[PDB]
Amino acid sequence: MSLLEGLALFLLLLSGVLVVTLRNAIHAALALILNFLVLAGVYVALDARFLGFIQVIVYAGAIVVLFLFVIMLLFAAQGEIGFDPLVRSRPLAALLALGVAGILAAGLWGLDLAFTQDLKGGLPQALGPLLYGDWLFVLLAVGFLLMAATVVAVALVEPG
Template sequence: MQVVLFGICALLAIVGAVGVITARNPVYSALFLVLNFFSLAGLYLSLEAQFLAVTQVIVYAGAIVVLFLFVIMLLNLRPEDLPRFRLDRTGPLVVLLSLGLLLGVGMGIWSLLGASFPQDPQAQAVGTVESLGRALFGRYLVGFEVVAVLLLVAMIGSVMLAKRRFQ
């Protein structure tokens, strides 16, 4: 069951990521991004992180992608305004660079490739709301409060930026 869920979601996540990069129209990119976020939520579910799976759907697929789509509609780009790909000289170099990055990270996680997840009930209950809530409102309470201030600052900043007219 977990293998099937992992296979489908991993495949869909990669298809979504490739779609975001290759789609010419930003609206299609945003829709592929939704596919990517939803399949990541599926991957979280297969890792027994239920709370994060739900948060992923609400925050990313719900709020962030909707924000992207709103901005795309607000800008109202004509097809001839869409920037082209950067495929001249730098294209192959970039692809090579990313593959090198993948290789480097792959070598870094080589020793962990075969590690299997612990199956005792205590380790499986790590992703429940109870366990996360205890950590979030216990050890990490200061971080939680700071994040609240960060969101307030971001809200004020974005309103200021979008309102002001630069000369």
């Protein structure tokens, strides 16, 4: 494992650093696309194949285009526009970031359990019966959310 494992997790984290450090919206957003690929790979590796493919299709194929369209639409040549009293607050921000990992890290050495179940590879065959089985309600909730989103979104943008 840890030969290959290292590679993927290093890449993932490294990519993570890039998307929150770098200057300029486009390079930034684009890094997040490399991120979601890696993450997609990691899904596949963990016997969730279906979820993997949806990761690429939605989150990295639909969503980020929308991002890119917004940052093109309204331009973005600085990830650091203006100068304003916020400057010292860069180190307290970086401090707290460590903290929020620290407490969560602590927690995870606090229940350590077996990784040992099957999953069928996650293929959409075997997810189907559950999804429209007893999760059918949750689903219809989803469906309502999307519709609400569309209508809301319109009302914000177009006058009308």
